């Protein structure tokens, strides 16, 4: 309490220094994040079936392990997709609060019941269960300043020497290699094989037999014979290491001594395990790693660990190899937090100068300026106790808690100065009186201002974490600001205030004299005839933009989805990606620093007809003006890529979450609960697409996410004919698979590393249907017969990527809400699917739509509860049921101001806007008490006339209100005009609060007849 | 059984090591392969790590790489145990 | 815990040099560190140095010309000298393994490899010597 | 006792028994998991 | 015969099951009816 | 040892700062605390 420290200033300075030190230590170990882990944890099961088609990798793999995904708790949903590459991808999304480790350990226990039921190819390829984000924490490209290594060689080096060291780094959920490590590629030649009466089965068997690592016991192994005088290991054949050793693999010996070696009927080389992904950096050949963030892991520390890991493998790179970062989303977070910590220090510099224009004394203005940092440091410590991190929300909070913080330091210092000036007391007695006067009042406004934010901590919802973070940050700061006001400022203002320019103070004197003269004319009804205009500005004056919780900003990065027509090859996708790269590096050069084009990487589904280009933009400063922003760059790009033929090139902006919030669109999923099949489900999707096409007002951009049915080659192997000719069905299947699909045989040792050995046909002999004629099968009598002898082939149609939602076949329809109109009401599809689709097809929601189903309209309840609690706290502080009304009529003014910018600057009702509104509704209320408290106090002492103390002897004490208003207007001045990183949320709060306070400072001091209406209009 | 330092390294230790990622709070990993048909991989985790969760995560990475090991190794069995304090006591049993 | 004065250095092979080149580097490091007794003492390798190993090279062409499954040769060698565990048997109340191995006296010297015969594809037993050669070499008994 | 840590504790020493199980049991696959002993509700399906 | 997972609310688990059954009902064949021959949740409601 | 980076001096520098502060709060003077902090070596020499 503020008397034990007045005589003991050294005791109050020690407390302040201790709080500052605690705040320092907190920041040192306080996580720099961007938002407080909103995304629900997701667990991904990925399996691989070589040479498979979407159907043959779903019936054998997907729904063999998906029928076992039962008894897993806290599971919102499960979506699987299986594509013609031979890959499966089952994503289980759990509840928001689930423990990802326990969710990854139960998904693993239940997958192991289906693990032995899978094909051997899938098992020996490697099933990976890994918890991670759906988008890349970063991408680490690997160029060659020279030209000594091709993209395949760079990919091999990255995979062998960098990929696994990186993947073990803590916080790295998963790494996707944009390439493929070497493997011993045996390109079989069907002509040579047929010439020697051989088949791919014989080649595979020979490789397996002659490429092995054999355990051959010991020369003196135990149990030992008596008198054993030697012990050594026996070293039988080992794994072959070089392409020369494989070439000598003896397939068979001819009757006339003509040895047949592997190199005779095949080409042996070192080549990627898979040739799908092909990366390029600004045109040149390159490779890289796309790193995801393990769920519930900090991105900043993970990236720091990644960059550090790379800096210790860098000394050992081959000459010429270099390392680039063509995609990194963490630098944006770092730079944005720099801007908030700077506008923090800047909103301290701005008050420091303002309280000089008013207090006009260096010593006097030094009491509150040092009461700001303490609180700020202190509240950091508080967060370290509560387990929160340093993110944009917590930091924008700290910034919005600059006025509410300094207001009392201002109250205390001005009150002590006023009493010294009036009664001429020495500083010690002056404050022993000022504090005894206004100690409990200042605490009482502490309770009132927290009642605006305490109900926000217990919001409840998906976004309730953001509200809780903001509310905790402000409540703690305000609590500490009052502790300081009761501990330090009484001790400071007792000692460092002197016990005793001109134009400025004279002008201020004239100013508040005129202000008091104007306020004396309180008896006038139009003050309130006008207040009705402010009141009616709630139902309307709403631009009604609730279509944004989080403004999507540059991130200094974006992707460029490339989706060629189904059936395109790798060369076509490479051409389109070259066009995209040329556009970015020629027409968009002054903004785009690099373009990492990954041909073959499938954002939705890996394939040959898909691509993606991670684009990194130049320094935010080197991009001045809106025209050089991401949303603009992406709009212009998409326009310029609409002139491209046979391709879908969409350049989009990634939001702040790993991935959520597609312009408040919908994520429809059409599922079928009857055994309709793919044909009827596709027809139902077509009907729904047609129905949604002719409702442009209500729906827009209803795009079917996924690949469209493509031709495929159905080759019926007549088994009866195969038995008649003596060929075995197993030989036929092995020949077809190993010739056209590639058959992983076993391992070999390359430079002391386990790598795979693959047997596949030479590219030229598996290109066309006619090439099926080149392949022969050896019958039981040694006679080679073609596939034409027992097989008949034709062209059919089949989907290249089959999806399932919650275990049933599904088709995902992405869409935008509507032109002008928002989402929620845009759910016409609920009443458009049942009535316009056949029986047996249902419909569902996923991701963003799923979360918005349960969440939604809860802010008004928060506002109502806060308002009632504030009103009650005011009633308690004032001991009257009617006085609080005179203070609850100043909330409209701040609300209406915040809306000046929601109108002039098209600001959306963001959560930033919601917390910014709350700020100036409990603050317009704060300045209202600054006026009604002294009005009441003077009304019960030194003048008992209502008018005397209402608008006359208290209005003249308007210095604090002006100092605080100007101090918190200058503090948020940068936030409004900021063009640094995160300028989005920066402006969102800045403009709203500035507009709120500026209309709530000028309309509130003059709406004083509300405290003069106490006469008979009680309640 | 019967394998040597480099037979059991090329067939077991490398296979296990390459599929030992995605484990949280992993300080480092060091493996020995003896000429006696033995592999003794050891993953040291960050202090303050939960032993049970770390062990189950390792056991999880190991049971998806098991199909890649030789049939002899799978048949023998691969055991993941959290190394802890020394023997409380040793109880010899003899025959007179 | 480990002694306070002690330190645990590692010589990683960051470029796939091999075992021999890494051993050369380790020898160089130990020799150099032996020149600083004032600061470093007892600087020694923790691992084991290479020992002789009996390498058996089954000639592929010989084995095929004679006619025998190289898998059969490998299985014979492994099960005879190292012991192939086969099945599980229950005796009283718990499963116990069934191990197949050669009798001790037949797998104790290099010459003993000549006592082992592999049945050819035509039912004729060929000795190891017919399709296999052997010599002493050097290998690591513990690779880390 | 939190059932999740109990389940992982049971699981990480059950897997120590796989060497001793007949290789047949492992092909079927054991299923260590939290479980109750009584039914919340039986939902029957008839055909009218 | 549905069970209650270790540490889950009987009334939230029983409402969710009823909702899922309701959403699967429209796709049932021509003749099929869900009955609840045993449910311990009506008791909870009555006792509360 | 290499990872920690010799944090003991940093932790004990904090203790020379916090002990000084707590003594300044007790003696309400910034100089008297030095009279107490100069008795630190009196025991260290004997122990050594
Ligand atoms: C949880 C409760 C923690 C303590 C409760 C207060 C204990 C009462 C004693 C007390 O505060 O003594 C006051 C000064 O002592 C002081 O030392 C003032 C307290 C200032 C904080 C000291 C350390 C921080 C004298 O006040 P009073 O309570 O006798 O009545 C006010 C009329 N003088
Ligand atoms: C006081 C509250 C926190 C202020 C931050 C530092 C100020 C003083 C430093 C130490 C004083 C108290 C220590 C404390 O609360 O935890 C330390 C700082 O906490 C943190 O900064 C968070 C780390 C998480 C620890 C849980 C405590 C909250 C780290 O504590 P520790 O590293 O020993 O935690 C081992 C858990 N087994
Ligand atoms: C009492 C005055 C409050 C000042 C600091 C409060 C201590 C922190 C605390 O317990 O608050 C959080 C939850 O409690 C709360 O929600 C508030 C209860 C305060 C006790 C902790 O939250 P946490 O458990 O994430 O902190 C990581 C710890 N291991
Ligand atoms: C949960 C809490 C329920 C809601 C309470 C509402 C908080 C409003 C606090 C402001 C009321 C101010 C008031 O009348 O009491 C003050 C102390 O309150 C402390 C000052 O009253 P005082 O103690 O200075 O009055 C001298 C005679 N003792």
UniProtKB/Swiss-Prot annotation, chain A:
Disruption phenotype: Loss of susceptibility to contact-dependent growth inhibition (CDI); inhibiting cells still contact the target. GO terms for molecular function: alkane transmembrane transporter activity; bile acid transmembrane transporter activity; efflux transmembrane transporter activity; enterobactin transmembrane transporter activity; identical protein binding; xenobiotic transmembrane transporter activity. It is found in: Cell inner membrane. InterPro entries: AcrB_DN_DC_subdom (IPR027463), Acrflvin-R (IPR001036), MdtF-like (IPR004764). Changing residue 512 to Y: Partially restores chloramphenicol resistance to an AcrZ G30R mutant. Keywords: Cell inner membrane, Cell membrane, Membrane, Transmembrane, Transmembrane helix, Transport. Residues 29-336, 386-391, 458-465, 542-857, 905-910, 979-984 are periplasmic. One of its GO terms (cellular component) is membrane. The chain crosses the membrane at residues 10-28, 337-356, 366-385, 392-413, 439-457, 466-490, 525-541, 858-874, 885-904, 911-929, 959-978, 985-1004. Its main location: membrane. The keyword Transmembrane helix applies. It is a multi-pass membrane protein. Residues 1-9, 357-365, 414-438, 491-524, 875-884, 930-958 are cytoplasmic. It comes from the Bacteria. Gene3D superfamilies: Multidrug efflux transporter AcrB pore domain (3.30.70.1440), Multidrug efflux transporter AcrB pore domain like (3.30.70.1320), Multidrug efflux transporter AcrB TolC docking domain, DN and DC subdomains (3.30.2090.10), Multidrug efflux transporter AcrB transmembrane domain (1.20.1640.10). Belongs to the resistance-nodulation-cell division (RND) (TC 2.A.6) family. The gene is acrB.
Swiss-Prot record, chain B:
Disruption phenotype: Loss of susceptibility to contact-dependent growth inhibition (CDI); inhibiting cells still contact the target. It is found in: Cell inner membrane. Induction: Positively regulated by MarA, Rob and SoxS transcriptional regulators (at protein level). AcrA-AcrB-AcrZ-TolC is a drug efflux protein complex with broad substrate specificity that uses the proton motive force to export substrates. Belongs to the resistance-nodulation-cell division (RND) (TC 2.A.6) family. Homotrimer, with large domains that extend into the periplasm, interacts with AcrA and TolC. AcrA may be required to stably link this protein and TolC. Interacts with AcrZ. Part of the AcrA-AcrB-AcrZ-TolC efflux pump. This is Multidrug efflux pump subunit AcrB. The lineage of its organism: Bacteria, Pseudomonadati, Pseudomonadota, Gammaproteobacteria, Enterobacterales. The chain holds residues 50 to 145 of 1049 of the full protein.
From Swiss-Prot, chain E:
It comes from the Bacteria. Induction: Positively regulated by MarA, Rob and SoxS transcriptional regulators (at protein level). Disruption phenotype: Loss of susceptibility to contact-dependent growth inhibition (CDI); inhibiting cells still contact the target. AcrA-AcrB-AcrZ-TolC is a drug efflux protein complex with broad substrate specificity that uses the proton motive force to export substrates. Homotrimer, with large domains that extend into the periplasm, interacts with AcrA and TolC. AcrA may be required to stably link this protein and TolC. Interacts with AcrZ. Part of the AcrA-AcrB-AcrZ-TolC efflux pump. Belongs to the resistance-nodulation-cell division (RND) (TC 2.A.6) family. This is Multidrug efflux pump subunit AcrB. It comes from Escherichia coli (strain K12). The chain holds residues 290 to 337 of 1049 of the full protein.
UniProtKB/Swiss-Prot annotation, chain F:
It is found in: Cell inner membrane. The chain crosses the membrane at residues 7-23, 34-48. Induction: Positively regulated by MarA, Rob and SoxS transcriptional regulators (at protein level). Disruption phenotype: Loss of susceptibility to contact-dependent growth inhibition (CDI); inhibiting cells still contact the target. Residues 24-33 are cytoplasmic. AcrA-AcrB-AcrZ-TolC is a drug efflux protein complex with broad substrate specificity that uses the proton motive force to export substrates. Belongs to the resistance-nodulation-cell division (RND) (TC 2.A.6) family. Homotrimer, with large domains that extend into the periplasm, interacts with AcrA and TolC. AcrA may be required to stably link this protein and TolC. Interacts with AcrZ. Part of the AcrA-AcrB-AcrZ-TolC efflux pump. This is Multidrug efflux pump subunit AcrB. It comes from Escherichia coli (strain K12). The gene is acrB. The chain holds residues 866 to 913 of 1049 of the full protein.
């Amino acid at each position: 309490m503020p008397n034990f420290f007045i005589d003991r200033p050294i005791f109050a300075w020690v407390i302040a220094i201790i709080i500052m030190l605690a705040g320092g230590l907190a920041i040192l170990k306080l996580p720099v994040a961007q938002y407080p882990t909103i995304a629900p944890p997701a667990v991904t099961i990925s399996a691989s079936y070589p040479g498979a088609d979407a159907k043959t990798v779903q019936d054998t793999v997907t729904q063999v392990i998906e029928q076992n995904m039962n008894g897993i708790d806290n599971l919102m949903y499960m979506s699987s997709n299986s594509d013609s590459t031979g890959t499966v991808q089952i994503t289980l999304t759990f509840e928001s609060g689930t423990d990802a480790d326990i969710a990854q350990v139960q998904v693993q226990n239940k997958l192991q019941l289906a693990m032995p039921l899978l094909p051997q190819e899938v098992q020996q390829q490697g099933v990976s269960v890994e918890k991670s984000s759906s988008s890349f924490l970063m991408v680490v490209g690997v160029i060659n300043t020279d030209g000594t290594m091709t993209q395949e060689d760079i990919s091999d080096y990255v995979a062998a020497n960098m990929k696994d060291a990186i993947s073990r780094t803590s916080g790295v959920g998963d790494v996707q290699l944009f390439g493929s490590q070497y493997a011993m590629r045996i390109w079989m030649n069907p002509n040579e094989l047929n010439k020697f009466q051989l088949t791919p089965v014989d080649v595979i068997t020979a490789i397996k037999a002659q490429n092995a690592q054999v355990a051959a016991g010991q020369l003196g192994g135990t149990p030992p014979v008596k008198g054993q005088q030697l012990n050594a290991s026996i070293i039988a054949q080992t794994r072959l290491t070089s392409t020369e050793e494989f070439g000598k693999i003896l397939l068979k010996v001819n009757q006339d001594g003509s040895r047949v070696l592997l190199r005779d009927v095949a080409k042996i080389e070192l080549g990627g395990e898979n040739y799908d992904i092909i990366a390029e950096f600004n045109g040149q050949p390159a490779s890289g790693l796309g790193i995801k963030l393990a769920t519930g892991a900090n991105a900043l520390d993970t990236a720091a660990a990644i960059r550090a890991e790379l800096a210790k493998m860098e000394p050992f790179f081959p000459s010429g190899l270099k390392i680039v970062y063509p995609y990194d989303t963490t630098p944006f977070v770092k730079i944005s937090i720099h801007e908030v910590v700077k506008t923090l220090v800047e909103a301290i510099i701005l008050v420091f100068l303002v309280m000089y224009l008013f207090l006009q004394n260096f010593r006097a203005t030094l009491i509150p300026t040092i009461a700001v940092p303490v609180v700020l440091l202190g509240t950091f410590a508080v967060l370290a106790a509560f387990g929160f991190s340093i993110n944009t929300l917590t930091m924008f909070g700290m910034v919005l808690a600059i006025g509410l913080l300094v207001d009392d330091a201002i109250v205390v210092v001005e009150n002590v100065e006023r009493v010294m000036a009036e009664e001429g007391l020495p500083p010690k007695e002056a404050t022993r009186k000022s504090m005894g006067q206004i100690q409990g009042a200042l605490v009482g406004i502490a309770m009132v201002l927290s009642a605006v934010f305490v109900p926000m901590a217990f919001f409840g919802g998906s976004t309730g974490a953001i509200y809780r973070q903001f509310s905790i940050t402000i409540v703690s700061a305000m609590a500490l600001s009052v502790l300081v006001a009761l501990i330090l400022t009484p001790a400071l203002c007792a000692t460092m205030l002197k016990p005793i320019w001109f134009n400025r103070m004279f002008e201020k004197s004239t100013h508040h004299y005129t202000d008091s003269v104007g306020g004396i004319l309180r008896s006038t009804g139009r003050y309130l005839v006008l207040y009705l205009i402010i009141v009616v500005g709630m139902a309307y004056l709403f631009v009604r933009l609730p279509s944004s919780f989080l403004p999507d900003e540059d991130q200094g990065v974006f992707m460029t989805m490339v989706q060629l027509p189904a059936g395109a090859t790798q060369e076509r996708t490479q051409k389109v990606l070259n066009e995209v790269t040329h556009y970015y590096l020629t027409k968009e050069k002054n903004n785009v620093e690099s373009v990492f084009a990954v041909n073959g990487f499938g954002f939705a589904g890996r394939g040959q007809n898909t691509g993606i280009a991670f684009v990194s933009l130049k320094d935010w400063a080197d991009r001045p003006g809106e025209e050089n922003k991401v949303e603009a760059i992406t709009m212009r790009a998409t326009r310029a890529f609409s002139q491209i033929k046979d391709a879908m090139v969409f350049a989009f902006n990634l939001p702040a979450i790993v991935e959520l919030g597609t312009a408040t669109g919908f994520d429809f999923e059409l599922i079928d609960q009857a055994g309709l099949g793919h044909e009827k489900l596709t027809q139902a999707r077509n009907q729904l697409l047609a129905e949604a096409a002719k409702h442009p007002d209500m729906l827009t951009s209803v795009r079917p996410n996924g690949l469209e049915d493509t031709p495929q080659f159905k080759i019926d192997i007549d088994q009866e004919k195969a038995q008649a000719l003596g060929v075995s069905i197993n030989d036929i299947n092995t020949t077809l698979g190993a010739a056209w699909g590639g058959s992983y045989v076993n391992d070999f040792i390359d430079r002391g590393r386990v790598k795979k050995v693959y047997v596949m046909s030479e590219a030229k002999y598996r290109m066309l249907p006619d090439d099926i004629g080149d392949w022969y099968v050896r019958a039981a009598d040694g006679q080679m017969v073609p596939f034409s002898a027992f097989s008949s082939s034709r062209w059919e149609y089949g989907s290249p990527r089959l999806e399932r939602y919650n275990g049933l076949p599904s088709m995902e329809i992405l869409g935008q809400a509507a032109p002008g109109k928002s989402t929620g009401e845009a759910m016409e599809l609920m009443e458009q699917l049942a009535s316009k689709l056949p029986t047996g097809v249902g419909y569902d929601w996923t991701g963003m739509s799923y979360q918005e189903r349960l969440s939604g309209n809860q802010a008004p309840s928060l506002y109502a509860i806060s308002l009632i609690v504030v009103f009650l706290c005011l009633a308690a502080l004032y001991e009257s049921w009617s006085i609080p009304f005179s203070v609850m009529l100043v909330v409209p003014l701040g609300v209406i101001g915040a809306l000046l910018a929601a109108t002039f600057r098209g600001l959306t009702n963001d959560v930033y806007f919601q917390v910014g509104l709350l700020t100036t509704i409990g603050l317009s209320a704060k300045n209202a008490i600054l006026i009604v408290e002294f009005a009441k106090d003077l009304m019960d002492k030194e003048g008992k006339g209502l008018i005397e103390a209402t608008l006359d002897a208290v209005r003249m004490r308007l210095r604090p209100i002006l100092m605080t208003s100007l101090a918190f207007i200058l503090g948020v001045m940068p936030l409004v005009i900021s063009t640094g990183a995160g300028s989005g949320a920066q402006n969102a709060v800045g403009t709203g609060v500035m507009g709120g306070m500026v209309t709530a400072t000028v309309l509130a001091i003059f709406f004083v007849p509300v405290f003069f209406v106490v006469v008979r209009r009680r309640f």
